[PDB]
């Protein structure tokens, strides 16, 4: 059957400033099947507080799901995504950089 | 607004 | 400009452990209206854009009953699928169905789709011309001859020509402000260096609606496409998107390097130079 591998892209959804409250996203897109783990991650344990787009697909019928939640970036505190999928042999971790 | 089975 | 209504409808099975889970949701361009969740306790079609609310309660009731017969008949389909397939009890498939249509400038009919696809592929699609259809495979071939003796596409073009294009124009109208909008890139580009002989050149584009750019690289004039890294259009989650496009290059060669943007939104493609 046909699986085609989520691309993971984490990022905030306005330029990031120390101590100015944000929303956190992580967006996976050209999945197939649509059974998906993602996870958003503050200092590596999962954040409870997420909210998720409703599942929808592209002219070529992979899958694409928004994952978000507010936040306030800080100086010391670490982001990312974990996902898992069954294209991928253990779960990823892409980690948040804001300086892309 | 919304309007068959295979 | 043009405009499109879609609506996306995906039902997965999920042997023994309950009936199918089905999703639906409708967009007008890239903006999604409503949703439906086979799996969530209210078991209605719900608003997801603030233009819809509006909408009174026969439209609600009306949207509720035919989403739910939509999702009885991907049921159906489920099993006849795993028939025409030969397929176990056992494993998961995913049927996913999508229909709508565009409307040029004037907001008159312009063209109407209605297309399926099983575990991923292609299965049927309705032509251009929506008298005809295209059958992927044999098992297709058999909906084909199925939908030809029930008279299948005369119904649909009866729909795509008409209802589809008239709530379209009706949302254009109510949702104005956010759907006849067309907000242009911000543009920029980022300079790091990977090592002390290399440095990677992204160009960005931010808070743009609607989701369609093009973002490309050139050195000396030329395209870079097999150098360059495009990341997939993405939503910031406000209405806007967001891309971006990276080649590294030499370090001492940026000024050869080029990246241009093109939009709706913008009255002329923008090109940026480090220099």
Redesign the interface.
């Given at each position: 059957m046909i699986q085609r591998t989520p691309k993971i892209q984490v990022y905030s959804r306005h330029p990031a400033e120390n101590g100015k409250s944000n929303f956190l996203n992580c967006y996976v897109s050209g999945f197939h099947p649509s059974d998906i783990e993602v996870d958003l991650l503050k200092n590596g344990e999962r954040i409870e507080k997420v909210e998720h787009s409703d599942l929808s697909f592209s002219k070529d019928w992979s899958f694409y799901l928004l994952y978000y939640t507010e936040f306030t970036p800080t100086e010391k505190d670490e982001y990312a995504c974990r996902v898992n999928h069954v294209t991928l042999s253990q779960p990823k971790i892409v980690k948040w950089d804001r300086d892309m | 607004x919304?309007?068959?089975?295979? | 400009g043009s405009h499109s209504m879609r609506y996306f409808f995906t039902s997965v099975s999920r042997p023994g452990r309950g009936e199918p889970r089905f999703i639906a949701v409708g967009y007008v361009d890239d903006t999604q209206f409503v949703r439906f969740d086979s799996d969530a306790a209210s078991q209605r079609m719900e608003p997801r854009a603030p233009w819809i609310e509006q909408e009174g309660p026969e439209y609600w009731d009306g949207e509720t009953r035919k989403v739910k017969a939509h999702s009885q008949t991907h049921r159906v389909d489920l099993g006849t699928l795993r028939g025409y397939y030969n397929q176990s009890e056992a494993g998961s498939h995913t049927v996913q169905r999508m229909y709508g249509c565009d409307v040029g400038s004037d907001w008159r009919f312009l063209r109407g789709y209605h297309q399926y696809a099983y575990d991923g592929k292609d299965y049927i699609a309705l032509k251009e011309d929506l008298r005809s259809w295209t059958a992927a495979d044999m098992a297709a071939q058999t909906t084909k001859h199925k939908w030809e003796a029930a008279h299948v596409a005369e119904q649909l073009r009866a729909y795509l020509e008409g209802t589809c294009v008239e709530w379209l124009r009706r949302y254009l109208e109510n949702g104005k402000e956010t759907l006849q909008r067309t907000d242009a890139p911000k543009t920029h580009m980022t300079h790091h260096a990977v090592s002390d002989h290399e440095a990677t050149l992204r160009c960005w584009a931010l808070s743009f609606y609607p989701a369609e750019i093009t973002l490309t690289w050139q050195r000396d004039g030329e395209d870079q496409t097999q150098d360059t890294e495009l990341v997939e259009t993405r939503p910031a989650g406000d209405g806007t998107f967001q891309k971006w496009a990276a080649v590294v290059v030499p370090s001492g060669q940026e000024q050869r390097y080029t990246c241009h943007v093109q939009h709706e939104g913008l009255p002329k493609p923008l090109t940026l130079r480090w220099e």
């Open positions: - | 919304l309007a068959l089975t295979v | -």
